[PDB]
């Protein structure tokens, strides 16, 4: 697990460590794996990025 730099979670306002769940539809919306696992924002397709690079 790595920190995705300058990314904040729009579910819990924490950092995004490990997989980043970035919404494909909204311009600027992201979930940490805990907020993704709780079923936040499930109306929109996302990209799941296991690491920043």
């Amino acid at each position: 697990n790595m920190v995705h730099p300058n990314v904040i979670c729009d579910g819990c306002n924490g950092p995004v460590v490990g997989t980043r769940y970035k919404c494909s539809v909204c311009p600027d919306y992201d979930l940490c794996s805990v907020c993704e696992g709780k079923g936040l924002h499930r109306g929109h397709t996302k990209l799941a990025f296991p690491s920043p690079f």
Binding site: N6, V7, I8, D10, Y29, D30
Partner: peptide, 4 residues
Amino acid sequence: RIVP
């Protein structure tokens, strides 16, 4: 979100 991005905090740039």
